[PDB]
Scaffold this active site. Sequence first.
Site, short mmCIF file in Angstrom:
data_model
loop_
_atom_site.label_atom_id
_atom_site.label_comp_id
_atom_site.label_asym_id
_atom_site.label_seq_id
_atom_site.Cartn_x
_atom_site.Cartn_y
_atom_site.Cartn_z
N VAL A 1 18.15 23.46 -41.62
CA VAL A 1 17.21 22.51 -41.48
C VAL A 1 15.90 22.87 -40.54
CG1 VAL A 1 18.18 20.98 -39.61
CG2 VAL A 1 16.65 20.24 -41.42
N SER B 1 12.95 16.47 -21.51
CA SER B 1 12.50 17.62 -20.46
C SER B 1 11.82 17.09 -19.25
CB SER B 1 11.60 18.95 -21.01
OG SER B 1 11.04 19.60 -19.98
N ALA C 1 3.30 16.28 -23.81
CA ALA C 1 2.94 15.04 -24.61
C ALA C 1 4.28 14.73 -25.63
CB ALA C 1 2.03 15.30 -25.54
N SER C 2 4.80 15.90 -26.41
CA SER C 2 6.01 15.71 -27.15
C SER C 2 7.02 15.16 -26.46
CB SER C 2 6.21 17.20 -27.86
OG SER C 2 6.67 18.05 -26.90
N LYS C 3 7.41 15.67 -25.41
CA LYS C 3 8.62 15.34 -24.62
C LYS C 3 8.69 14.01 -23.94
CE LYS C 3 11.22 19.20 -25.55
NZ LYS C 3 12.45 18.94 -26.51
N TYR D 1 3.48 20.40 -25.07
CA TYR D 1 5.01 20.50 -24.98
C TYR D 1 5.12 19.03 -24.01
CZ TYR D 1 9.50 21.60 -23.51
OH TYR D 1 10.99 21.68 -23.31
N1 LIG Z 1 14.81 26.06 -21.43
C1 LIG Z 1 14.08 25.08 -20.77
O1 LIG Z 1 13.78 25.53 -19.46
C2 LIG Z 1 14.28 23.61 -21.18
C3 LIG Z 1 14.64 23.47 -22.58
N2 LIG Z 1 14.22 22.25 -22.90
C4 LIG Z 1 14.79 21.76 -24.67
O2 LIG Z 1 15.82 22.33 -24.79
C5 LIG Z 1 16.03 22.25 -26.62
C6 LIG Z 1 16.32 23.68 -26.92
O3 LIG Z 1 15.95 24.57 -26.08
P1 LIG Z 1 16.50 26.02 -26.08
O4 LIG Z 1 17.90 25.58 -26.03
O5 LIG Z 1 16.04 26.76 -24.98
O6 LIG Z 1 15.94 26.50 -27.29
P2 LIG Z 1 16.20 28.17 -27.95
O7 LIG Z 1 15.20 28.90 -27.74
O8 LIG Z 1 17.55 28.46 -27.50
O9 LIG Z 1 16.28 27.78 -29.27
C7 LIG Z 1 15.80 26.32 -29.58
C8 LIG Z 1 16.70 26.04 -30.75
O10 LIG Z 1 15.38 25.57 -31.53
C9 LIG Z 1 16.19 26.02 -32.88
N3 LIG Z 1 15.50 25.24 -33.65
C10 LIG Z 1 14.15 25.41 -33.81
N4 LIG Z 1 13.63 24.49 -34.80
C11 LIG Z 1 14.77 24.22 -35.48
C12 LIG Z 1 14.92 23.52 -36.57
N5 LIG Z 1 13.69 23.22 -37.14
N6 LIG Z 1 16.05 23.22 -37.06
C13 LIG Z 1 17.27 23.39 -36.28
N7 LIG Z 1 17.05 24.19 -35.10
C14 LIG Z 1 15.96 24.53 -34.67
C15 LIG Z 1 16.38 27.28 -32.81
O11 LIG Z 1 17.46 27.59 -34.19
P3 LIG Z 1 16.89 28.85 -35.30
O12 LIG Z 1 16.25 29.64 -34.39
O13 LIG Z 1 18.31 29.43 -35.62
O14 LIG Z 1 16.44 28.09 -36.20
C16 LIG Z 1 17.18 27.33 -31.60
O15 LIG Z 1 18.52 27.26 -31.37
C17 LIG Z 1 14.36 22.09 -26.71
O16 LIG Z 1 14.54 20.65 -26.94
C18 LIG Z 1 13.88 22.53 -25.61
O17 LIG Z 1 12.51 22.15 -25.42
C19 LIG Z 1 14.05 20.97 -22.19
C20 LIG Z 1 13.94 21.37 -20.76
C21 LIG Z 1 13.82 22.84 -20.54
#
Ligand SMILES: NC(=O)C1=CN([C@@H]2O[C@H](COP(=O)(O)OP(=O)(O)OC[C@H]3O[C@@H](n4cnc5c(N)ncnc54)[C@H](OP(=O)(O)O)[C@@H]3O)[C@@H](O)[C@H]2O)C=CC1
Lengths: 234, 243
Positions: B61, B141, B157-159, B155
């Site tokens: 998805v 975040s 704004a969206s969060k 970023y």
């Molecule tokens: N790392 C940080 O410092 C911080 C991260 N966050 C938040 O953590 C959450 C995830 O970040 P993180 O774990 O680092 O991300 P990653 O870079 O590890 O990957 C993010 C995830 O996004 C998935 N993804 C993107 N679009 C889709 C989609 N449309 N459908 C399903 N999966 C999707 C990718 O899956 P695939 O590529 O397989 O499609 C991937 O697993 C986010 O909401 C991010 O903003 C919040 C604060 C801090």
Amino acid sequence: METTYALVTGGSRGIGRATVLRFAREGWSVVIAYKSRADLAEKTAEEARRLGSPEAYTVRVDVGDPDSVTEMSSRVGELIPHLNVLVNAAGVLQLGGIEETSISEWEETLRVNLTGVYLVTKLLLPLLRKAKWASIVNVASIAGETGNVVAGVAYSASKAGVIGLTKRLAVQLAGYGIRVNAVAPSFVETDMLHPLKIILKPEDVAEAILFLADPRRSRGITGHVLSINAGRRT
Amino acid sequence: METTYALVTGGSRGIGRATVLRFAREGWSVVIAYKSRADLAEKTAEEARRLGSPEAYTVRVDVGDPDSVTEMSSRVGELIPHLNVLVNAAGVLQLGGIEETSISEWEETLRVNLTGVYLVTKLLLPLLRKAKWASIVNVASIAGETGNVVAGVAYSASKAGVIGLTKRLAVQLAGYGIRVNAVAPSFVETDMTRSFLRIASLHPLKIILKPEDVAEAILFLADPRRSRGITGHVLSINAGRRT
Ligand SMILES: NC(=O)C1=CN([C@@H]2O[C@H](COP(=O)(O)OP(=O)(O)OC[C@H]3O[C@@H](n4cnc5c(N)ncnc54)[C@H](OP(=O)(O)O)[C@@H]3O)[C@@H](O)[C@H]2O)C=CC1
Ligand SMILES: NC(=O)C1=CN([C@@H]2O[C@H](COP(=O)(O)OP(=O)(O)OC[C@H]3O[C@@H](n4cnc5c(N)ncnc54)[C@H](OP(=O)(O)O)[C@@H]3O)[C@@H](O)[C@H]2O)C=CC1
């Protein structure tokens, strides 16, 4: 000092109009940005001139449309040498839960209420950077602060987004000396539950916006959300 | 009496993956929603089954696309009878000030990080309402709570929008007995390697935030045995960087 120029989106009605007139009483030149009510905008401009604006201009713009905003920007640059104050007050209300909020309604609400603020600010930044001093005030809402208020899910999300944008811009633009703040009013009575027994008027919000816009009053305040809710939420 | 089913977007990497696995250790069945790496999602499913998930499914998805989310909900509805837990962890990073952030960059960031949470929640609400108990946890975040962080304007704004959405849904969906909370982590070791040869000195607690640390907070908020009286809350995980 240089002449003060302020631009207010949604300047022909409600809070925006009240803000334009409050700025006029301050002797600030104003630019009234409106979407379609050219008649109301010109009548607002006439009252601003009477009240004290050395100059009062009107400019047509749909804040949720990139091309419209880019054109407004060019247009404004032809009318004034710099911009000291930008007030984003062109938000639209939305009601309903997530089930009753259609995808197109959600998107339209975000486009106007959140993306519009980003677009107007982005395109007018060059004019703001030309000023000797500048400030930006965004009109958010108590709905962006709390879920405990009757407001559509898209409205709450968009307003909270405006608050997040306000804070990040404050930190990032502080380097240019540009302050960025927001007001978060509760229900406001316009042409469209709390301990203090009063009814907020657009002029009440305008006073708060003026406070945050004027460096003589808030030069040390940036990235703050000034809540105006008669005590409904502390 | 009824099996626990949990769906996690972004379930094949980072926080989402760690969460799916933590859910598996709890004996919960999981649906791993991913965007493109079908191979990694299947590996996650395998590990989940090994860890304790009675059942583990994978579904593709793009949370930013309405058709994809609608199709995802239909597929999920054919694999499970109901949904007890939904975690939206499919967010993407965005860096840059307003001048550096293009209109398309801004729109795509909002579309994925904010509109995507709305889309997924909206299309899966029927399944959540079918359960005897349900909870939603959105991953926000620290960037959505304060401007004093390095993250792009879009970023942040969206969060912040995700937090506002979380709060309003908590109040609105409380009527169905559905709880809605958010976790707001700061820097987390993930595929954001860009920041690696300092970040550990950004906070009072001299630690390194891991995806599994966030997964623990998400579990707490997802499990009613632990947090039945908590809804509309933002659980900040930043090792004291912000109090
Ligand atoms: N790392 C940080 O410092 C911080 C991260 N966050 C938040 O953590 C959450 C995830 O970040 P993180 O774990 O680092 O991300 P990653 O870079 O590890 O990957 C993010 C995830 O996004 C998935 N993804 C993107 N679009 C889709 C989609 N449309 N459908 C399903 N999966 C999707 C990718 O899956 P695939 O590529 O397989 O499609 C991937 O697993 C986010 O909401 C991010 O903003 C919040 C604060 C801090
Ligand atoms: N009333 C309330 O309870 C609260 C209101 N607010 C906020 O106040 C701000 C304004 O609300 P309010 O004064 O009631 O709104 P009004 O209903 O009075 O009108 C809103 C303004 O939006 C303008 N507008 C909409 N789109 C554009 C655009 N694209 N470009 C220029 N103007 C535009 C309209 O101008 P035209 O129609 O002429 O184009 C109008 O003046 C918004 O940010 C709103 O969310 C915040 C909290 C509470």
